[PDB]
Design a protein around this motif. Structure first.
Motif, PDB file in Angstrom:
ATOM      1  N   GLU A   1      26.895 -14.372 -63.778  1.00 46.02           N
ATOM      2  CA  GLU A   1      27.974 -13.432 -63.490  1.00 46.02           C
ATOM      3  C   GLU A   1      27.459 -12.003 -63.511  1.00 46.02           C
ATOM      4  O   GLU A   1      27.722 -11.227 -62.583  1.00 46.02           O
ATOM      5  N   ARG A   2      26.732 -11.642 -64.575  1.00 43.78           N
ATOM      6  CA  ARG A   2      26.022 -10.369 -64.633  1.00 43.78           C
ATOM      7  C   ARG A   2      25.284 -10.101 -63.333  1.00 43.78           C
ATOM      8  O   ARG A   2      25.565  -9.122 -62.631  1.00 43.78           O
ATOM      9  N   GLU A   3      24.361 -10.997 -62.981  1.00 48.41           N
ATOM     10  CA  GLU A   3      23.490 -10.768 -61.834  1.00 48.41           C
ATOM     11  C   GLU A   3      24.274 -10.704 -60.524  1.00 48.41           C
ATOM     12  O   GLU A   3      23.938  -9.910 -59.635  1.00 48.41           O
ATOM     13  N   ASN A   4      25.316 -11.533 -60.372  1.00 50.59           N
ATOM     14  CA  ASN A   4      26.046 -11.524 -59.103  1.00 50.59           C
ATOM     15  C   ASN A   4      26.846 -10.236 -58.921  1.00 50.59           C
ATOM     16  O   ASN A   4      26.879  -9.676 -57.821  1.00 50.59           O
ATOM     17  N   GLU A   5      27.526  -9.769 -59.971  1.00 56.82           N
ATOM     18  CA  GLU A   5      28.344  -8.570 -59.825  1.00 56.82           C
ATOM     19  C   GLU A   5      27.493  -7.384 -59.394  1.00 56.82           C
ATOM     20  O   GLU A   5      27.879  -6.631 -58.493  1.00 56.82           O
ATOM     21  N   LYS A   6      26.320  -7.222 -60.014  1.00 56.05           N
ATOM     22  CA  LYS A   6      25.392  -6.169 -59.611  1.00 56.05           C
ATOM     23  C   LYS A   6      24.994  -6.328 -58.153  1.00 56.05           C
ATOM     24  O   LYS A   6      25.011  -5.358 -57.388  1.00 56.05           O
ATOM     25  N   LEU A   7      24.618  -7.545 -57.753  1.00 53.93           N
ATOM     26  CA  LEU A   7      24.377  -7.807 -56.337  1.00 53.93           C
ATOM     27  C   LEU A   7      25.592  -7.424 -55.501  1.00 53.93           C
ATOM     28  O   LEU A   7      25.473  -6.673 -54.527  1.00 53.93           O
ATOM     29  N   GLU A   8      26.775  -7.923 -55.877  1.00 54.87           N
ATOM     30  CA  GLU A   8      28.013  -7.535 -55.204  1.00 54.87           C
ATOM     31  C   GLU A   8      28.125  -6.019 -55.069  1.00 54.87           C
ATOM     32  O   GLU A   8      28.393  -5.502 -53.980  1.00 54.87           O
ATOM     33  N   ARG A   9      27.931  -5.283 -56.168  1.00 53.48           N
ATOM     34  CA  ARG A   9      28.039  -3.832 -56.074  1.00 53.48           C
ATOM     35  C   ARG A   9      26.951  -3.265 -55.167  1.00 53.48           C
ATOM     36  O   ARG A   9      27.228  -2.452 -54.278  1.00 53.48           O
ATOM     37  N   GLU A  10      25.704  -3.702 -55.356  1.00 49.28           N
ATOM     38  CA  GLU A  10      24.629  -3.105 -54.576  1.00 49.28           C
ATOM     39  C   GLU A  10      24.794  -3.403 -53.094  1.00 49.28           C
ATOM     40  O   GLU A  10      24.521  -2.546 -52.250  1.00 49.28           O
ATOM     41  N   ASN A  11      25.269  -4.590 -52.757  1.00 50.57           N
ATOM     42  CA  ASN A  11      25.429  -4.916 -51.350  1.00 50.57           C
ATOM     43  C   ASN A  11      26.512  -4.068 -50.715  1.00 50.57           C
ATOM     44  O   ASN A  11      26.357  -3.619 -49.577  1.00 50.57           O
ATOM     45  N   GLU A  12      27.609  -3.833 -51.438  1.00 49.62           N
ATOM     46  CA  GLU A  12      28.654  -2.964 -50.908  1.00 49.62           C
ATOM     47  C   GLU A  12      28.087  -1.611 -50.487  1.00 49.62           C
ATOM     48  O   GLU A  12      28.413  -1.114 -49.408  1.00 49.62           O
ATOM     49  N   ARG A  13      27.227  -1.009 -51.322  1.00 47.06           N
ATOM     50  CA  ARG A  13      26.627   0.282 -50.974  1.00 47.06           C
ATOM     51  C   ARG A  13      25.788   0.177 -49.709  1.00 47.06           C
ATOM     52  O   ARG A  13      25.806   1.085 -48.870  1.00 47.06           O
ATOM     53  N   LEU A  14      25.015  -0.909 -49.578  1.00 55.15           N
ATOM     54  CA  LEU A  14      24.163  -1.071 -48.408  1.00 55.15           C
ATOM     55  C   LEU A  14      25.000  -1.273 -47.157  1.00 55.15           C
ATOM     56  O   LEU A  14      24.673  -0.728 -46.095  1.00 55.15           O
ATOM     57  N   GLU A  15      26.078  -2.062 -47.269  1.00 61.17           N
ATOM     58  CA  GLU A  15      27.023  -2.214 -46.168  1.00 61.17           C
ATOM     59  C   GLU A  15      27.487  -0.857 -45.665  1.00 61.17           C
ATOM     60  O   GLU A  15      27.520  -0.601 -44.456  1.00 61.17           O
ATOM     61  N   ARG A  16      27.846   0.033 -46.590  1.00 62.18           N
ATOM     62  CA  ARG A  16      28.379   1.327 -46.188  1.00 62.18           C
ATOM     63  C   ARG A  16      27.314   2.161 -45.489  1.00 62.18           C
ATOM     64  O   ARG A  16      27.577   2.748 -44.432  1.00 62.18           O
ATOM     65  N   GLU A  17      26.093   2.195 -46.043  1.00 65.62           N
ATOM     66  CA  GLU A  17      25.002   2.939 -45.408  1.00 65.62           C
ATOM     67  C   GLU A  17      24.747   2.455 -43.976  1.00 65.62           C
ATOM     68  O   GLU A  17      24.609   3.261 -43.045  1.00 65.62           O
ATOM     69  N   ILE A  18      24.669   1.144 -43.777  1.00 71.20           N
ATOM     70  CA  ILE A  18      24.447   0.631 -42.425  1.00 71.20           C
ATOM     71  C   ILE A  18      25.626   0.975 -41.518  1.00 71.20           C
ATOM     72  O   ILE A  18      25.441   1.359 -40.355  1.00 71.20           O
ATOM     73  N   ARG A  19      26.853   0.880 -42.040  1.00 74.20           N
ATOM     74  CA  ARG A  19      28.023   1.193 -41.224  1.00 74.20           C
ATOM     75  C   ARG A  19      28.027   2.646 -40.783  1.00 74.20           C
ATOM     76  O   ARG A  19      28.572   2.968 -39.721  1.00 74.20           O
ATOM     77  N   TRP A  20      27.414   3.531 -41.569  1.00 70.65           N
ATOM     78  CA  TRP A  20      27.350   4.944 -41.209  1.00 70.65           C
ATOM     79  C   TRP A  20      26.205   5.236 -40.260  1.00 70.65           C
ATOM     80  O   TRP A  20      26.299   6.145 -39.433  1.00 70.65           O
ATOM     81  N   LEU A  21      25.108   4.500 -40.384  1.00 65.26           N
ATOM     82  CA  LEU A  21      23.943   4.784 -39.562  1.00 65.26           C
ATOM     83  C   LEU A  21      24.017   4.106 -38.199  1.00 65.26           C
ATOM     84  O   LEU A  21      23.498   4.648 -37.218  1.00 65.26           O
ATOM     85  N   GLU A  22      24.648   2.932 -38.108  1.00 68.70           N
ATOM     86  CA  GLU A  22      24.933   2.373 -36.787  1.00 68.70           C
ATOM     87  C   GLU A  22      25.976   3.210 -36.050  1.00 68.70           C
ATOM     88  O   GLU A  22      25.844   3.459 -34.845  1.00 68.70           O
ATOM     89  N   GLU A  23      27.016   3.659 -36.762  1.00 71.15           N
ATOM     90  CA  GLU A  23      28.060   4.469 -36.143  1.00 71.15           C
ATOM     91  C   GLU A  23      27.547   5.847 -35.748  1.00 71.15           C
ATOM     92  O   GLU A  23      28.043   6.438 -34.781  1.00 71.15           O
ATOM     93  N   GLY A  24      26.569   6.376 -36.475  1.00 69.67           N
ATOM     94  CA  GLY A  24      25.972   7.649 -36.120  1.00 69.67           C
ATOM     95  C   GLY A  24      25.164   7.608 -34.836  1.00 69.67           C
ATOM     96  O   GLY A  24      24.502   6.614 -34.534  1.00 69.67           O
TER      97      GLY A  24
END
Length: 192
Positions: free
Chosen positions: A10-33
């Motif tokens: 659970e520890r490890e997944n939540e961190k992955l969950e959080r970290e992936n959300e950030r990466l999703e946002r970065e890609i969504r901004w750089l493809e849209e840019g």
């Protein structure tokens, strides 16, 4: 013990969950840019967030309540995880190991899924970043935007009256300590 496995995943997944959300946002901004446009509007977004930080900081007259609330919120987190550990053992003792092992199985499937996606997302960003200079600027500004976002919300969980807040959190601590005691009494009763 199985619960030691469950906690770890659970520890490890939540961190992955959080970290992936950030990466999703970065890609969504750089493809849209039109990247220069995206940079300007991030500056304005960060500009608005920094003034909000300043506004909220001024609505805090004393750091002493802030410290206290932070301390109580931490204690509340400690007590809730410990109560959850006691409830899981109690269920396990009462009802057997089939329920953890299925939870573990689901958690190790999601863990693998989460790690696979993380590696893909991180791979995409490196490719997106590439001979580009604006791209790093966009990275930093999004990172700054993330921290300001977190800071505005921190200051929002405080400001409403700071002492009314401490009053609430201390009552919650009483409830959790009462619950903790009941769960330990049931646990000792079961392991007798």
């Amino acid at each position: 013990s199985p619960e030691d496995e469950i906690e770890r995943l659970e520890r490890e997944n939540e961190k992955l969950e959080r970290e992936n959300e950030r990466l999703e946002r970065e890609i969504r901004w750089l493809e849209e840019g039109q990247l220069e446009d995206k940079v300007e509007e991030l500056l304005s977004k960060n500009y608005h967030l920094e003034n909000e930080v300043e506004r909220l900081k001024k609505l805090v007259g004393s750091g002493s309540p802030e410290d206290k609330i932070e301390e109580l919120k931490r204690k509340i987190e400690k007590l809730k995880r410990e109560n959850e550990r006691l409830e899981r053992e109690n269920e396990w003792l009462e009802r057997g190991s089939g329920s953890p092992e299925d939870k573990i199985e689901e958690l190790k499937r999601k863990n693998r899924e989460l790690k696979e996606k993380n590696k893909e997302l991180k791979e995409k960003i490196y490719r997106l970043k590439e001979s580009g200079q604006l791209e790093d600027k966009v990275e930093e500004l999004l990172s700054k935007n993330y921290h300001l976002e977190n800071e505005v919300e921190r200051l929002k969980k405080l400001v409403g009256s700071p002492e009314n807040e401490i009053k609430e959190l201390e009552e919650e601590i009483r409830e959790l300590e009462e619950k903790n005691e009941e769960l330990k009494r049931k646990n000792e009763w079961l392991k007798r």
